[PDB]
Amino acid sequence: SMIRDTLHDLHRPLGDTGLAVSPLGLGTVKFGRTIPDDREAADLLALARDLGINLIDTAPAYGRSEERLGPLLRGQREHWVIVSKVGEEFVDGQSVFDFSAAHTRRSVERSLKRLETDRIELVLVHSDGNDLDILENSEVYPTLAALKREGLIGAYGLSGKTVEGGLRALREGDCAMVTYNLNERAERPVIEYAAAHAKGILVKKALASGQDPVRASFELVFDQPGVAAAIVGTINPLHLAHNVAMAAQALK
Template identity: 75%
Template sequence: MSQATLHAHHRPLGSTGLMVSPLGLGTVKLGRDQGVKYPNGFQIPDDDEARMLLKLSRDLGINLIDTAPAYGRSEERLGPLLRGQRQAWVIVSKVGEEFVNGQSSHDFSAAHTRYSVERSLQRLETDFIDLVLVHSDGNDLAILNQCEVYATLEDLKREGKIRGFGLSGKTVEGGLKALESGDCAMVTYNLNEQAEKPVIDYAAAHGKAILVKKALASGHVCLSPGVDPVRASFELVFGHHGVASAIVGTINPLHLAHNVATVAQVLRNL
């Protein structure tokens, strides 16, 4: 049987004009192994392993890659690893959260937002980032209403340094507010947590983009015997037509291929 791929399943990322694979590769594990909530420990892959993972992703039809300054060395590793392939990838990064010496801190000021995006451009060795999301600390509405981060991202979009912006948030109110003037919301949506579904509904009605994080509940989901949790998760996620893509952070090539095959099957049956 030939390997299932997602090449035929690329879809619009809201109204950004970008086409993305329904699965995106999350890269926290390329850069950081402290303070991450996974059921099993892991080792950060070396450059050869990372290169093979990126090549496999491309071969499987994945063109969406998700990174962040808070993912340790992820961005600075991706720059050299993606050299010569910029056109092949839609890159999502973030602003607002820093991770230094095992500690997270947040800064949503105009100056830090601009500094952070310029630094991401340098690290990723690119002159534009496709999508930049505000890395919320959970105070979504306060960040959007009281901080300068969103207005600054709007300026950076006008300047051509980013193509779109939005919020990786934690609340329904924040997600809805973020989509009013932004392009995208990243929401948690899985078999355990569906509270942010109204944000996906709004996006579907208004031509906005939704990226799903924790689609597989970071590996924690429990189901009745005989039910494939990966398949059940993707049936839920892609059963909502407002979802553009689910970001899954695996560094295991077998898991990646299994996820792709499962998504391809689920999409064919929708």
């Protein structure tokens, strides 16, 4: 219990989705692609939970993250708001992208199966950078809309890289995951827009290259009232506990 500061009383709505999330979410890239032992992974989830985190982020592109998480979340699935993605696939050395309706449908079914559940709270488009083109000219977004209607997903959105893309994702979608940190502020307009219209924002890569550095990052991020949560990947339980502490303090 060198862990007095937790996030239990700091949960926040993710726009108008009706979902309530901790201001930190556990990133999960490293579960699939030094990888944690099943044991190490279970302890990390257990610790996240006791620190008041209920948000977890994954993706088909993150190696076997999805595959491993299903079993790991058995018995506790209900606690967790799961975020996953569609469109980036990772075959051989490299990233393969497919934003067709067929593949969107195939990926989300496979994600439900891998995660041993009947629904995922949020599914975001896994952009290659060309956000606006994908949103306007591919089938992915209307397919996600359909999957939302059918109950397979609770909400949908974009994990984008451009401001033009983040704004458009929010016109009909529910949430934009954006990059925002001490070194990159270009996507700030997307956050400010979301705040004006009760829309979801998740920040990815809140901590980056270059008076605690994590606190400085979180003080920047949570100074923007649009942000619901920051997704931080970590396999170091001491870093997790520290990150939680700094988030709690930044939100006084």
